[PDB]
Amino acid sequence: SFHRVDQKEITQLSHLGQGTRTNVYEGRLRELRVVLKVLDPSHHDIALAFYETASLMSQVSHTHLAFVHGVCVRGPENIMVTEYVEHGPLDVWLRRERGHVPMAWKMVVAQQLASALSYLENKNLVHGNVCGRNILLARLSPFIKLSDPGVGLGALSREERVERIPWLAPECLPSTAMDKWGFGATLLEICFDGEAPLQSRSPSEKEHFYQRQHRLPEPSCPQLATLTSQCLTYEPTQRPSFRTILRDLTR
Amino acid sequence: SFHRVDQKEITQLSHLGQGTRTNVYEGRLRELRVVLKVLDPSHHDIALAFYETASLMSQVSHTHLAFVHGVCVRGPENIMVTEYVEHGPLDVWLRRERGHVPMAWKMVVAQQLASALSYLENKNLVHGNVCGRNILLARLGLAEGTSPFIKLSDPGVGLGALSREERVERIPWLAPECLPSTAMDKWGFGATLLEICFDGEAPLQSRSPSEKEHFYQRQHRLPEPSCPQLATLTSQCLTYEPTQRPSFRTILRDLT
Ligand SMILES: CNC(=O)c1nnc(NC(=O)C2CC2)cc1Nc1cccc(-c2ccc(C(=O)N(C)C)nn2)c1OC
Ligand SMILES: CNC(=O)c1nnc(NC(=O)C2CC2)cc1Nc1cccc(-c2ccc(C(=O)N(C)C)nn2)c1OC
């Protein structure tokens, strides 16, 4: 399971942003700089999907996976106490640095992300929310940590799942295979300097794109074109394993 | 000398704060993020002291010294175009984080500052305005396995061009011999160490100009820092006799 944190051990500081049904803050854990993921007032099935994320992340240990200190229950709020990463989300940094991010830097990120996902695949564990926003920069060569997936994908509404297109695996709209799709969509996002395909488009348009099984663009980066195309296949069984992806990233 | 920047190359944005006879803004250099230090409408001796700072900064290169892109003349305003440092002034950060700044973090800052000042000392160059406000944070060093990373800002309008009233406002950072040499920077460094140790709460800073001046006139000494690893260092730096102050070579060696 996960460690229980008393509210006396933590101090809530600046607001960093928002997640699905959460508010993200900087904080202190009694001293360590932490990140506090404050769950909105929620029903037991939502809080349970949040505890399951805490449980999963507490039972894993990988260099490219962010640490989870535990969970604090503060009135109607569930707080996941997590590792603070220096430079924050990758997507934000790619947009600020657009047109000035070298291809070699992007390959380092891809390799490190595939390493974290290969580790989870071998343990038959699913992340379910691979995207640039969940990729944290510990070092700007770069060093990443994949964040916890927040509230589990299984507990969200159709509307929330449509909002996650193109990162959301198509089989999830109506298995470790979903993370191959998430990984492929993240590679496109990285290649396009944080500008993911379909992100501006309406929910109806995003859903229609998946319903007709239209395919996402080929990345402008040629070394990742075959990889993304193989990952972004509608047939989950047709997606390469992370062992294969990781092996193909060394060459 | 320094690079001349045309006004067509720059964009002025948010106000960051004020310096001695300046207004500090975020801006853009054609599009690079920069800091623009806008000199007030001034006398030629003040513009000259500002050009000398730009000249000095343009001829130096060190990892813990902030970069100066050049100067723009627009038109009764002189604009120094400088490097933008992510987290800004150290003194502001120390006050926000008061009581939560570890000693090991403070020692890193001290070594990086002494490294920048040792480089200037070897080149016989004087900064003249070492204080927490001129120490900029490029990296915070809050995460485990990470260290702070500082950039010492340009000294702005030169100390020699300011009024006695402006020099009294600079106590306790201002070297006492400057009230009526590279030695002044050893005093500035010592006063900055006290400020860092006291989480951005420098001694005498609340006190009146009369009190501050009297403190120097009577040659009263500044307090010993609450941090024991820097007590001997600060006491040696904060000596009224400029020749009695240790060299940055000695200070830097003693900090390792
Ligand atoms: C384990 N630690 C962390 O996650 C973390 N660590 N360090 C930092 N540091 C800084 O920001 C440094 C710069 C000060 C930040 C971090 N988290 C973080 C910050 C802001 C928003 C989200 C967010 C956003 C969206 C979602 C979500 O629902 N989707 C579907 C993506 N979820 N969360 C977030 O999580 C990814
Ligand atoms: C080389 N680059 C810079 O100086 C600089 N870079 N990045 C940032 N970033 C942020 O603020 C990030 C956080 C948004 C800020 C910067 N500096 C800056 C900002 C505001 C006021 C002063 C100031 C104040 C006082 C004096 C002065 O008179 N004395 C006597 C010391 N002088 N200047 C200042 O200069 C030290």
A31 touches chain B (CB under 8 A): yes
Q: Is residue A245 a contact partner of residue A183, using CB atoms and an 8 Å limit?
A: yes
Residues 6+ apart with CB under 8 A from A141: A105, A108
Number of Cβ within 10 Å of residue B249's Cβ equals 12
Query: Are B100 and A28 a contacting pair at CB < 8 A?
Result: yes
Q: Contacts by B97-106 with C-beta closer than 8 Å and gap 24+?
A: B97/B199, B98/B199, B98/B200, B98/B201, B99/B199, B100/A28, B100/A31, B101/B199, B102/A31, B103/B227, B103/B229, B105/B141, B105/B147, B105/B148, B106/B196, B106/B197, B106/B227, B106/B230
Letter for the amino acid at A43? H
Entry resolution (Å): 2.3
CB atoms within 10 A of CB B101: 18
| Structure tokens belonging to residue B231 | 């007590």
Distance CA B113, CA B107 (A): 10
CA distance B199 to B99: 7
Assess whether the previous peptide bond of B172 is cis (omega < 30° from 0). yes
C-alpha B43/C-alpha B251 separation (Å) is 38
Q: Do A247 and A230 contact (CB within 8 A), yes or no?
A: no
Closest CA to B79 of B51, B37, B45: B37
Expressed in angstroms and rounded, the spacing between residue A242 Cα and the centre of ligand 1 is 24
Query: Exposure string (b/e) for B162-174, b if CB count within 10 Å is 16 or more?
Result: beeeebbebbbbb
A138 touches chain B (CB under 8 A): yes
Q: DSSP string covering B101-163, please?
A: --HHHHHHHHHHHHHHHHHHHHTT------SGGGEEEEE---STT---EEEEPP--S-GGGS-
| β-pair partners for A26 | A35
Cβ(B121) – ligand 2 distance below 6 Å: no
Element (H, E) at B245: none
Nearest to A86 by CA among B91, B183, B142, B229: B142
Q: What is the distance between the alpha carbons of residues B232 and B237, in angstroms, rounded to a whole number?
A: 9
Question: What is the residue whose two structure tokens read 């695949």?
Answer: A121
Give ∠ CA A142-A145-A147 in degrees, rounded to 5.
145
The structure was resolved experimentally with: X-ray
CB A186 within 8 A of CB A132: yes
Determine the distance in angstroms separating the CA of A84 from the nearest CA of chain B, rounded to an integer.
Answer: 6
Two tokens, residue B37: 């230090």
Closest by CA position to A64, among listed A130, A156, A150, A155: A130
Domain edges within chain B: 1-84, 85-256
Closest residue of B to A34, CA-based?
B143
d(CA A64, CA A145): 4
Q: Are B142 and A31 an interchain contact pair (Cβ–Cβ within 8 Å)?
A: no
Q: Nearest Cβ partner of A85 from B102, B139, B143?
A: B143
Cis status, amide bond into B75, omega within 30 of 0 = yes
